[PDB]
Design a protein around this ligand. Structure first.
Ligand SMILES: Oc1ccc2[nH]ccc2c1
Ligand SMILES: Oc1ccc2[nH]ccc2c1
Ligand SMILES: Oc1ccc2[nH]ccc2c1
Ligand SMILES: Oc1ccc2[nH]ccc2c1
Ligand SMILES: Oc1ccc2[nH]ccc2c1
Ligand SMILES: Oc1ccc2[nH]ccc2c1
Lengths: 268, 269
């Protein structure tokens, strides 16, 4: 992969692997989400962020502050098949003092056609207290030089699917998958549950019949609280409708919300 | 990746990804095991095996026969770090009428030094009845042209760990992790549990303190029965032993039916 000519975005090509595909012989949405993190990580490294994995500025490390995902929104028009080459372009932009947004564009490297797009909201949090903080002047100055100054959006539409407020699923749920626990493979280099594991957990309560006759087109997921490697999660789903579903992940015991989301599926 | 000059082995390079590494900032043994399947799959495709994923000959498809793993043996000297390039070479050889063996050699693409090696035993099974069988003459003729004829072993040693018989763990186990279930990400393109998920399940009952102070050096795993996507597994571990050795057992949560048995050897960090 490499930074573009202006040094304000990063592109990388990936050949889809045999173990990265599902029943349709195309990449799962979890494989796509993993590739989005990989190209984001590779972009931060290319623009000077140290080999520790955190895209944190010098002042952020002094204050023990890290970036955390608040929301992920993915829309796939075509999933790449095993052996196909997908090209992904990523970039970041400041959203005032609220935080930052990382966007992605997926293309079929053979035709150049846009096959998907994704957007994410990131907030500054103290890594020890877990307290959310607004973005200070000094910190924004350190990362503005890595962002395009004119707006560049993967989802330009005024008040579109990526910015739609998500309601809380009311009991009883139509479908559920209980007792979901992460294993060591679900953790990252810092022993925290990988963000992509939560997408997998959300999708677990989708009936197999919907999976067998539909393809996932859109997924929006809000991140409320982390699952610790010793926690247990319940995944709840209710059809709201193409088929649309409302989702909720909560702790198995006390019912504490960890994520909420929505998915849109198209008939095969 | 590409076949070597003689067309009897296949090499492929991989750049280790950020999400493929563990706490030490090196590739997990599950990432390595996934790369071993990928290079094996790419080798079968390169030598003519159809895009359906099964390295099955024309006569095997007519008889509804597939290859299934009986045993996996992996030994890692050094795990590659995030951003490092690992080169993996793979090949297959017939083991008479018993079945086939696929071997792998892992190298640091920068120094060329051998950083790991792996071997696996494969048996022929009817896809529908699940009945195992010896390899017929006609089937062996179809795949011999893809194998080196002179023996080529990743584990040449006289008393190597890849061929050592594994005992059954006796209750009570010293350690355990119960209620392990696969999710859709654990399945393959045919809706079957990926072989690498079982390695993950075996390793779940290793205490976190061993993980935090040791590195996995060797793992041998026997595959007895398949876990269905609706099954639930218990992972059992008992220390058998500078180095730490463990005996492992995966069994169904309810009836206690054996899924896998194995052994791991760990060395102090
Ligand atoms: O989704 C991700 C995950 C990790 C990252 N590091 C830097 C950007 C980025 C994006
Ligand atoms: O912390 C940041 C913010 C904006 C960025 N653009 C590119 C990398 C990056 C890291
Ligand atoms: O909750 C929000 C809303 C907008 C945002 N922009 C960037 C981060 C963020 C978080
Ligand atoms: O380990 C593996 C898995 C799948 C495969 N297909 C062909 C060879 C091979 C090896
Ligand atoms: O079925 C087989 C046996 C040996 C092989 N060598 C390479 C691919 C392959 C497939
Ligand atoms: O149990 C065994 C023993 C030797 C073998 N060689 C190939 C498959 C196989 C299985």
């Amino acid at each position: 992969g490499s930074l573009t000519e202006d040094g304000l975005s990063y592109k990388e090509k990936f050949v889809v692997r045999s173990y990265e595909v599902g029943s349709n012989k195309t990449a799962t949405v979890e494989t796509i989400a993993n590739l989005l993190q990989e190209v984001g990580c590779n972009h931060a490294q290319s623009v000077g962020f140290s080999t520790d994995g955190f895209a944190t500025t010098t002042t952020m490390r002094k204050l023990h502050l890290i970036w955390v995902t608040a929301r992920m929104h993915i829309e796939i028009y075509k999933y790449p098949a095993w052996g196909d080459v997908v090209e992904i372009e990523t970039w970041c932009q400041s959203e005032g003092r609220i935080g930052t947004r990382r966007d992605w564009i997926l293309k079929d490297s053979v035709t150049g056609e846009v096959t998907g797009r994704a957007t994410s909201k990131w907030v500054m949090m103290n890594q020890d207290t877990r307290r959310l903080q607004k973005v200070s002047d000094d910190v924004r100055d350190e990362y503005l030089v890595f962002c395009p100054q004119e707006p560049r959006l993967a989802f330009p539409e005024e008040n579109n699917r990526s910015l739609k407020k998500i309601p809380k699923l009311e009991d009883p749920a139509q479908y559920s998958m209980i007792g979901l626990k992460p294993r060591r493979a679900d953790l990252d280099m810092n022993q925290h549950v990988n963000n992509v594991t939560y997408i997998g957990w959300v999708l677990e309560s989708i009936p197999q019949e919907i999976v067998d006759t539909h393809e996932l087109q859109v997924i929006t997921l809000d991140y409320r609280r982390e699952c610790q490697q010793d926690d247990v999660v319940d995944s709840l789903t209710t059809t709201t409708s193409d088929s649309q579903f409302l989702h909720l992940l909560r702790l198995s015991g006390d019912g504490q919300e960890i994520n909420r989301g929505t998915t849109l599926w198209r008939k095969k």
